[PDB]
Amino acid sequence: IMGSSVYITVELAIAVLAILGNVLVCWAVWLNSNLQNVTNYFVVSLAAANIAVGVLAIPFAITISTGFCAACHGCLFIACFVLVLTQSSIFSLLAIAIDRYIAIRIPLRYNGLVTGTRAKGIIAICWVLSFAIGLTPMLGWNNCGQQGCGEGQVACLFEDVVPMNYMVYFNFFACVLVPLLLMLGVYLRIFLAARRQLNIFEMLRIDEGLRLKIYKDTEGYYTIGIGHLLTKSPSLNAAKSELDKAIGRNTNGVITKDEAEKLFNQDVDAAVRGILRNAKLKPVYDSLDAVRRAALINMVFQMGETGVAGFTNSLRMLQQKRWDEAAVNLAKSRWYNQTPNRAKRVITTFRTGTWDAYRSTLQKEVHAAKSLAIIVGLFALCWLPLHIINCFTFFCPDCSHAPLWLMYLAIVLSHTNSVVNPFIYAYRIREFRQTFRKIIRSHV
Numbered sequence: 001i002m003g004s005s006v007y008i009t010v011e012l013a014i015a016v017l018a019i020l021g022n023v024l025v026c027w028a029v030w031l032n033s034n035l036q037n038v039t040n041y042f043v044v045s046l047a048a049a050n051i052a053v054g055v056l057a058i059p060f061a062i063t064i065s066t067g068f069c070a071a072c073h074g075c076l077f078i079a080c081f082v083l084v085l086t087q088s089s090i091f092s093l094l095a096i097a098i099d100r101y102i103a104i105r106i107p108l109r110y111n112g113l114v115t116g117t118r119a120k121g122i123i124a125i126c127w128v129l130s131f132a133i134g135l136t137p138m139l140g141w142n143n144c145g146q147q148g149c150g151e152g153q154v155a156c157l158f159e160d161v162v163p164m165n166y167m168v169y170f171n172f173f174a175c176v177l178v179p180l181l182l183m184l185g186v187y188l189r190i191f192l193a194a195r196r197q198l199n200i201f202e203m204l205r206i207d208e209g210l211r212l213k214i215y216k217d218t219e220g221y222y223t224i225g226i227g228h229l230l231t232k233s234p235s236l237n238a239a240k241s242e243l244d245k246a247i248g249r250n251t252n253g254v255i256t257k258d259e260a261e262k263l264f265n266q267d268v269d270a271a272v273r274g275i276l277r278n279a280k281l282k283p284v285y286d287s288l289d290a291v292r293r294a295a296l297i298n299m300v301f302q303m304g305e306t307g308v309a310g311f312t313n314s315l316r317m318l319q320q321k322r323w324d325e326a327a328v329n330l331a332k333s334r335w336y337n338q339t340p341n342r343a344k345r346v347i348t349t350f351r352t353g354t355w356d357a358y359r360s361t362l363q364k365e366v367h368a369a370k371s372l373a374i375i376v377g378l379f380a381l382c383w384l385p386l387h388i389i390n391c392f393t394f395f396c397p398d399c400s401h402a403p404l405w406l407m408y409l410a411i412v413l414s415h416t417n418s419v420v421n422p423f424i425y426a427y428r429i430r431e432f433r434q435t436f437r438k439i440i441r442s443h444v
């Protein structure tokens with residue numbers, strides 16, 4: 001069997017695989033309401049782009065490898081679409097990655113930044129850029145201006161109509177490499193967040209939250225950082241002025257993470273001084289190690305000293321280092337009943353003296369980082385070979401040419417992006433995974 005038959009069969013097989021898997025992803029989000037979030041707005045968009053790739057782009061990419069005689073612009077149109085439909089997938093993928101950057105790195109401002117309306121607005125921007133970039137050759141940047149096929153006709157091959165300086169300068173750098181570098185920067189950032197060094201600052205950030213902008217707290221007072229009240233005055237300018245005084249520089253109501261940590265360490269200093277001046281809490285705070293002290297401070301920040309001093313029985317056990325007995329006793333209060341998540345983490349800290357309960361909470365980010373490593377690795381493996389090949393053909397024509405099977409393999413790889421990248425991310429999600437199981441077992 002000759003090569004062309006192998007290429008078409010493999011290219012067609014990938015088309016079905018790209019269609020089946022991405023139909024599944026949209027099906028799951030369609031019936032399961034736990035998947036009807038804003039993140040999966042982007043996931044479904046990518047699945048749509050990938051169904052079109054399997055339906056239209058792949059048959060086109062095949063077509064523009066047969067070399068039949070065609071009107072130069074009629075063959076140019078075919079080529080540009082496969083460029084459009086594939087651009088649409090790259091940018092759609094980039095939108096998912098960024099949604100995950102904000103969701104993990106900046107969870108408090110996420111729901112505000114990324115809404116259904118903002119999402120559909122971004123998905124729109126993605127397709128508009130895809131058509132603009134993909135159809136640019138039709139504007140005039142084509143190899144058609146100039147025996148074998150006749151006048152006005154050329155042998156319909158990709159390179160015969162699409163210039164190589166468009167594929168290297170415009171298409172590769174601006175629309176393939178940049179997204180990859182962006183997506184890679186996303187992965188590395190989430191990787192450093194998931195594997196971050198833990199401390200009282202990180203503890204309170206997990207329990208209460210970090211805000212690098214000024215915000216009104218539950219009692220309407222302006223606040224910044226981790227619950228650091230600036231002023232009770234209704235004047236935002238006054239809040240901004242108090243902020244500048246504590247920071248030193250002029251902030252405009254915005255600080256860096258490093259500045260919120262200097263505000264926090266000052267609040268911690270304040271909390272300890274109050275603990276040391278409380279006759280009930282002083283003997284216990286002195287008898288604890290650093291990590292358990294941090295958990296005692298966690299309680300002060302939430303209830304104040306008088307509220308902590310009310311735990312006479314639990315405090316007693318802690319001073320005697322009766323960790324287990326102290327824990328079960330603390331599990332009884334209305335503190336636990338009203339904020340069980342936070343109290344359960346604080347108690348585990350008392351019982352173990354480690355950050356365990358607060359490193360367990362980062363496993364969700366660890367899971368997010370590994371899912372993105374797969375996205376960026378598959379993306380680099382699927383797209384770099386083909387575009388590296390173009391770069392060598394454009395900057396060094398006389399160079400040793402790669403064999404036809406490796407060249408066409410790079411094309412196959414570029415189209416395998418549409419079957420792995422969205423689906424693999426979905427399959428790593430328990431909800432998605434269970435929904436896939438439910439639909440295939442029932443309907444199939």
Ligand SMILES: CCNC(=O)[C@H]1O[C@@H](n2cnc3c(NCC(c4ccccc4)c4ccccc4)nc(C(=O)NCCNC(=O)NC4CCN(c5ccccn5)CC4)nc32)[C@H](O)[C@@H]1O
Nearest residue numbers: 061064065082083086087157158159393401407408414415
């Ligand atoms: C969002 C981004 N989107 C994309 O990148 C999509 O665009 C398509 N694409 C992107 N570069 C593509 C591309 N480069 C051209 C490249 C090449 C050709 C074939 C296979 C891989 C790469 C090339 C290399 C060397 C010389 C010229 C072009 N050739 C095709 C595409 O069909 N070739 C099929 C039709 N041509 C051909 O048999 N020519 C042959 C290739 C072998 N001979 C050679 C070899 C060395 C030197 C000279 N003569 C004779 C011409 N398609 C491409 C593909 O669908 C991508 O998924």
